[PDB]
Amino acid sequence: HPVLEKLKAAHSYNPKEFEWNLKSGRVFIIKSYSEDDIHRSIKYSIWCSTEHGNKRLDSAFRCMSSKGPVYLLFSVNGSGHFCGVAEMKSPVDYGTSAGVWSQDKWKGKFDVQWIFVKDVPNNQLRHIRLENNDNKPVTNSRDTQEVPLEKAKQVLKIISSYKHTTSIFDDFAHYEKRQEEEEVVRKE
RNA sequence: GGAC
C-alpha cells in the first residue's frame, strides 16, 4: 500500500539495535477495544486515552522534562498479545476531537512515535508481575497501568528480541480500504 | 455497560 510505504520510509520500525536497558523513563500499558484505532494511531502518529489516562500521561511527559522517554505498550482487549510500542512525543491537548477514532467518546490528542509494530503473545510476558498492581502479571493490566522501571526493562527486552510472525501491517490494506469505503457511506 |  502507498500509505504503508510512506510510513516505512519515514520511521525506523522494529529497530534491531533498540535500547531496552533504560537508565531513566516511564512506561505505561495502553489498552484499546478498537483495532481500527491502532491503525489510526500508526498512520497519524497520535493517541488519546480517557480523561483520567490523558492526565496521567500528560503528568509523566511533563515530569520527564526530555531526560528520558515515556513508552506506551499497546494491546487490544482480548487479543492475547501486545501489538507494539510507541514513545509519547508531546504534552496532551485535552479538548480536541481527532476525528479518526471509532467512537466519539475519545476526546483529546497527543503525539506519538511508533517504534515497534509486532505481535508478541501474552505467554512471552505473563511471568513478569507488577508489585504496584497486587503482583498481577503485566499482561493483566488496565489502560495506563504504570510498569515500574526494572520490570519495564524486562518487558522491553522481550518485545525487542521476539521473532514475530505477524503484525498489524499484515492487514494494512484492509484498514485503508475500510476507512475509505466507510467515509463514502457517511458522505452519501 | 467497558479502552484487564
UniProtKB/Swiss-Prot annotation:
Top-rank lineage group of the source organism:
Eukaryota
* Record note on what altering Y33A does: Strongly reduced binding to N6-methyladenosine (m6A)-containing RNAs
S-S bridge residues: none
Q: Could you name the Gene Ontology cellular component terms for this entry?
A: cytoplasm; cytoplasmic stress granule; P-body
Record annotation: effect of changing W106A: Abolished binding to N6-methyladenosine (m6A)-containing RNAs
Binding positions (RNA) = K31, S32, Y33, D37, W47, C48, N77, W101, W106
- Keywords of this protein's UniProt record, alphabetized? Acetylation, Cytoplasm, Immunity, Phosphoprotein, RNA-binding, Ubl conjugation
Impact after mutating W47A: Abolished binding to N6-methyladenosine (m6A)-containing RNAs
PTM field? Ubiquitinated by the CUL7-FBXW8 E3 ligase complex leading to degradation. Deubiquitinated and stabilized by USP5 by removing 'Lys-11'-linked polyubiquitination.
The YTH domain sits at 25-159
Q: Which GO terms describe its molecular function?
A: mRNA binding; N6-methyladenosine-containing RNA reader activity; ribosome binding; RNA binding
Query: Where does this polypeptide localize?
Result: Cytoplasm; Cytoplasm, P-body; Cytoplasm, Stress granule
One GO term under biological process is: mRNA destabilization
Let me see what the UniProt entry remarks about domains. The disordered regions have the ability to interact with each other and to 'phase separate' into liquid droplets within the cytosol following binding to mRNAs containing multiple m6A-modified residues. This leads to the partition of m6A-containing mRNAs into membraneless compartments, where mRNAs may be stored, degraded or used to transport mRNAs to dendritic arbors in neurons.
Q: How would you summarize the oligomeric state and partners of this protein?
A: Interacts with CNOT1; promoting recruitment of the CCR4-NOT complex. Interacts with ribosomes. Interacts with eIF3 (EIF3A or EIF3B). Interacts with YTHDF3.
Tell me, in a sentence or two, what this protein's role is. Answer: Specifically recognizes and binds N6-methyladenosine (m6A)-containing mRNAs, and regulates their stability. M6A is a modification present at internal sites of mRNAs and some non-coding RNAs and plays a role in mRNA stability and processing. Acts as a regulator of mRNA stability by promoting degradation of m6A-containing mRNAs via interaction with the CCR4-NOT complex. The YTHDF paralogs (YTHDF1, YTHDF2 and YTHDF3) shares m6A-containing mRNAs targets and act redundantly to mediate mRNA degradation and cellular differentiation.
- Report the sequence similarity comment from the record: Belongs to the YTHDF family. YTHDF1 subfamily.
User: Which named protein is this?
Assistant: YTH domain-containing family protein 1
State the covered range within the intact protein.
365 to 552 of 559
